[PDB]
Amino acid sequence: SGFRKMAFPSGKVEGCMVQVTCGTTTLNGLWLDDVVYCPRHVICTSEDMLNPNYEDLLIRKSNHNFLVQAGNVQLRVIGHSMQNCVLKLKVDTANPKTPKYKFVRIQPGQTFSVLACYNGSPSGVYQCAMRPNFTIKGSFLNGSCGSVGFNIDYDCVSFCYMHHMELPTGVHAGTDLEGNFYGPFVDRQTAQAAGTDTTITVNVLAWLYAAVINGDRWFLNRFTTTLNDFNLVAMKYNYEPLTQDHVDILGPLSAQTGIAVLDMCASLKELLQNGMNGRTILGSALLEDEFTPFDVVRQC
Amino acid sequence: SGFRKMAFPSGKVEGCMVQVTCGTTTLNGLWLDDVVYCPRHVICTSEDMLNPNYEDLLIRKSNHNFLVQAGNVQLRVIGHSMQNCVLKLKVDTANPKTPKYKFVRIQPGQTFSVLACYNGSPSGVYQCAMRPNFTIKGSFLNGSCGSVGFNIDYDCVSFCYMHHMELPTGVHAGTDLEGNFYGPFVDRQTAQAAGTDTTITVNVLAWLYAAVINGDRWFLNRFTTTLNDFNLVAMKYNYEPLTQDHVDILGPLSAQTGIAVLDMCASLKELLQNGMNGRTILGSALLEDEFTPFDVVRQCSGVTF
Ligand SMILES: CN[C@H](C(=O)Nc1cncc2ccccc12)c1ccc(Cl)c(Cl)c1
Ligand SMILES: CN[C@H](C(=O)Nc1cncc2ccccc12)c1ccc(Cl)c(Cl)c1
């Protein structure tokens, strides 16, 4: 019993964190095999940030401009290339702690663990979701760029995010491990703003199922609803519309608790109209949307 | 920016998790040097648990009854002894991944990271607080016993908790790494209940400072209060009393934000009597009490491990 926001054990990712320094900029790098991945903005100065030509700046760099440090050992950069917004530094030593890994691009609503690092040293691990507006609500300070988001499948680390920047509202933007940004963001100091964020409806529903599995039932009702009637109410509360894919994904939890998806949807509709009336669900006074259906099944 | 419930990196602890099997029971063990620590109830069956004489049960066990597995390698148990509610299995091989470590007993209000394990395999990490009633509001399924709680201080792991059981309300009880239970709990299948829990006041204050550091400041007011007036109001809302030690510990945060502790106490006093008025603090509608003052400083300053 119990329900917690739970991150994956970060050990397999800690053994990959290194420090990458280019000139006056120091950030984190992900050392996998003989390659160190890091945000390409490490090659930027003060002048080339509003409108940098990364292809031009990288052509001017030599292997000896990059200083890579893994623990108390300096790694030798023998090559450099750019893949989208990620810089790839070939090194003359393969990481002996390289776990089994994949690079995966996730969709909004998906969750992952973040290993926040500073100077190649892991400082904390927390759980995040890719917001529908493609930002993440992380906890990051200056020097955290290059910190990675990941999930663990048995023994395999799926790297899904690399931290690049903080937007003016305090939310964070980054890329997958192939350097493609999540969202309409660019690694330029140009005026950027996250779109209005919305609630991940399928995740709220999965969390309501987790609460039922844990013995919370006060929010349940005898109503059901149509998917269309639910979406029309949900959207007035800035909730994402629920698709037939989401209803199918909630199937196992529905079978486990004996509460049909559209029956749980009607309970969600009531919570939105009423509020919690001084009550909590799983120790929370707000509806939690950072637990996917797969997270709930895994944890329960 | 941002404020998250954040656990310590669990890597140094993952390299110590092993599987301990005794008869039909399989749980987790903590392998440090040539010793594997695990809950002493691993030697019990369902019948033994009702009224267990652990000293008598352990005397009947031989080293070969314990099956220890580190990854897919079996460790050979060359000795066994009991220290309070923890069983210590001497093995022939010292853990090469043994980090710098200490065994520490924590106080209520203190926080720590839990590496939840099943069959000696780490499955998740989360941050939690030792409640004033000495339970932890964890997330544990069957097989999680032997999962450990820890903090990291520089490059030293301080092991502070080992999971033993789940109480009828769904909250959890365990011991320090010397086998002494936190709280008035016993490792026997008997009627047990956690005492009425209270809020960790010093932690709520630290979290209010974290919110101010993050720009969330609607709850601040012009008022201050005496420590005595604050504690009289706090006592009525099931909040732990705030001591002069707590006021001193909140000092650096008071200096950083420009909000004196008793000034923040007057904000908390109003929040308790009037509520949040439909507003949130750090995206939460409840006052969060599982971040210590040190956790807030560490997170809002980027200390690494
Ligand atoms: C110097 N790196 C920053 C950046 O946002 N860096 C940070 C990352 N995370 C949190 C931070 C909190 C406070 C201050 C900086 C933080 C930056 C600025 C603009 C662009 Cl376009 C890019 Cl790619 C990067
Ligand atoms: C076999 N260990 C169980 C126990 O409570 N085991 C669990 C520990 N954590 C979470 C659980 C969730 C669901 C089911 C079991 C869980 C047990 C029973 C009574 C006593 Cl007195 C003791 Cl010491 C141990």
Side-chain angles (χ1 to χ4, degrees), chain A residues 231-281:
Chain A
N231 291 339
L232 292 171
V233 178
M235 295 185 302
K236 296 165 166 93
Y237 290 97
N238 257 19
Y239 269 58
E240 280 294 309
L242 201 75
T243 66
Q244 185 54 236
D245 292 10
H246 298 139
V247 168
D248 298 345
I249 288 166
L250 292 165
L253 288 166
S254 166
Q256 181 180 3
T257 64
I259 301 152
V261 180
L262 294 171
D263 177 4
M264 191 63 82
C265 285
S267 297
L268 177 48
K269 269 166 65 182
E270 186 178 83
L271 284 164
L272 302 181
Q273 152 197 275
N274 294 3
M276 301 236 191
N277 195 10
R279 289 185 282 234
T280 61
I281 297 168

Side-chain angles (χ1 to χ4, degrees), chain A residues 72-126:
Chain A
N72 257 91
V73 166
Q74 181 191 320
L75 298 179
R76 188 167 68 96
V77 175
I78 66 172
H80 64 264
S81 82
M82 183 169 62
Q83 181 174 16
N84 300 303
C85 305
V86 292
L87 176 64
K88 295 195 275 188
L89 302 176
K90 197 69 149 181
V91 290
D92 214 26
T93 299
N95 187 357
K97 300 182 192 154
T98 304
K100 281 181 251 277
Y101 76 94
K102 22 182 113 172
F103 288 172
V104 174
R105 180 170 181 91
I106 65 173
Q107 299 296 306
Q110 183 65 261
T111 60
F112 56 100
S113 308
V114 171
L115 181 66
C117 302
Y118 297 92
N119 298 291
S121 285
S123 51
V125 59
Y126 60 85

Side-chain angles (χ1 to χ4, degrees), chain A residues 4 7 11 122 139 290 299, chain B residues 4 14 125 137 139 290 299 305:
Chain A
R4 279 277 181 192
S139 184
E290 304 211 331
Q299 184 168 170
Chain B
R4 282 278 184 192
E14 293 166 51
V125 58
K137 296 184 157 200
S139 173
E290 303 206 343
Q299 183 167 172
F305 313 95

Side-chain angles (χ1 to χ4, degrees), chain B residues 20 27-29 37-43 54 85-87 144-147 162-164 175 187:
Chain B
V20 182
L27 44 65
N28 308 286
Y37 302 81
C38 75
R40 81 175 164 172
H41 66 74
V42 70
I43 71 184
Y54 288 103
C85 306
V86 144
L87 175 66
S144 66
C145 305
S147 292
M162 169 167 283
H163 186 58
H164 278 70
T175 69
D187 50 351

Side-chain angles (χ1 to χ4, degrees), chain A residues 41 49 54 140-145 163-167 172 181 186-190 192, chain B residues 1:
Chain A
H41 67 74
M49 269 261 82
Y54 288 106
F140 287 129
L141 302 173
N142 199 40
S144 57
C145 306
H163 181 58
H164 279 70
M165 60 188 206
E166 184 173 295
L167 295 178
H172 303 101
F181 258 95
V186 298
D187 48 2
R188 296 157 45 188
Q189 249 295 320
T190 194
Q192 301 185 76
Chain B
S1 299

